[PDB]
Design a protein around this ligand. Structure first.
Ligand SMILES: [Zn+2]
Ligand SMILES: [Zn+2]
Length: 47
Protein backbone atom coordinates (compact mmCIF):
# COMPACT_ATOMS: atom_id res chain seq x y z
CA UNK A 1 0.00 0.00 0.00
CA UNK A 2 0.91 3.66 -0.29
CA UNK A 3 2.07 3.83 3.33
CA UNK A 4 5.09 1.53 3.53
CA UNK A 5 7.05 3.82 1.22
CA UNK A 6 7.12 7.58 0.59
CA UNK A 7 7.90 9.38 -2.67
CA UNK A 8 11.01 11.48 -2.22
CA UNK A 9 9.28 14.03 -4.46
CA UNK A 10 5.75 13.74 -3.06
CA UNK A 11 4.80 11.67 -0.06
CA UNK A 12 3.50 8.31 1.22
CA UNK A 13 1.73 7.94 -2.15
CA UNK A 14 4.90 6.13 -3.27
CA UNK A 15 4.30 3.03 -5.37
CA UNK A 16 7.23 2.65 -7.77
CA UNK A 17 10.95 2.25 -7.10
CA UNK A 18 14.06 3.14 -9.10
CA UNK A 19 15.40 0.36 -11.26
CA UNK A 20 19.12 0.55 -10.72
CA UNK A 21 19.15 1.30 -7.02
CA UNK A 22 16.70 0.30 -4.31
CA UNK A 23 17.83 2.97 -1.87
CA UNK A 24 15.20 5.58 -2.78
CA UNK A 25 11.49 5.37 -3.56
CA UNK A 26 9.14 7.33 -5.78
CA UNK A 27 5.42 7.32 -6.56
CA UNK A 28 5.54 7.22 -10.34
CA UNK A 29 7.99 7.08 -13.24
CA UNK A 30 7.56 10.84 -13.60
CA UNK A 31 9.20 11.52 -10.23
CA UNK A 32 11.79 8.88 -11.05
CA UNK A 33 12.73 10.62 -14.29
CA UNK A 34 12.52 14.19 -12.93
CA UNK A 35 14.83 13.30 -10.04
CA UNK A 36 17.18 11.77 -12.63
CA UNK A 37 18.96 15.11 -13.05
CA UNK A 38 20.38 14.67 -9.55
CA UNK A 39 19.81 11.02 -9.28
CA UNK A 40 21.89 10.07 -12.32
CA UNK A 41 25.09 11.21 -10.59
CA UNK A 42 24.11 9.36 -7.40
CA UNK A 43 22.49 6.23 -8.83
CA UNK A 44 25.20 3.64 -9.19
CA UNK A 45 26.70 3.50 -5.75
CA UNK A 46 23.54 2.54 -3.86
CA UNK A 47 24.21 2.64 -0.16
ZN1 LIG B 1 18.47 4.98 -8.57
ZN1 LIG C 1 6.09 11.49 -6.65
Amino acid sequence: GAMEQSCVNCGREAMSECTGCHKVNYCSTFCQRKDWKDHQHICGQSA
